[PDB]
Design a protein around this ligand. Structure first.
Ligand code: CO
Ligand code: CO
Ligand code: CO
Lengths: 93, 93
């Protein structure tokens, strides 16, 4: 179990507001775990300065959410040869 | 194409309120299609024409939603020997 909260089967719903900070709360149980953030079904989002921040204690922080962040966001981690996914469905508050 | 709108990969978000009407809008392309309503992963919900009403042009109308209807609801239909599914995720504001 690399993720503290794991929504593999049914995604967790999270509210966002355009123009405001959005946390994708896939924090991990250990600092060695490598996490990838995806937006279904095409995009891989990488940590980048202040736009997208990774904090292993919190998850990914998107500094100012836009309508582009509306949809299915997935955190992925590979450990002990297995792939673990945790899924979030965002929509406006 | 038994369901007019088909949500498989990503379920469609439905806002619900306990004690109020809840519509699961899995309308179908013919009134001769039989549809079953399920709650993941265990339950089947049986329409009785009063508390839960089926209307092929609308979907399932649940009169008095309870917390038991919070979660992943699935409409299933078997036509021409094949099973089709469409998925809804109900959500409390
Ligand atoms: Co295994
Ligand atoms: Co066939
Ligand atoms: Co909402």
């Amino acid at each position: 179990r690399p993720f503290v909260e794991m929504y593999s089967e049914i995604p967790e719903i999270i509210h966002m507001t355009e123009g405001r900070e959005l946390v994708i709360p896939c924090r991990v149980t250990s600092p060695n775990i490598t996490v990838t953030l995806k937006k279904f079904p095409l995009d891989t989002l990488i940590p980048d300065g202040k736009r997208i921040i990774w904090d292993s204690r919190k998850g990914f922080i998107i500094s100012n959410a836009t309508y582009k962040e509306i949809g299915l966001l997935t955190c992925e981690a590979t450990v002990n040869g297995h792939l673990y996914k945790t899924n979030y469905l965002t929509h406006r508050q």
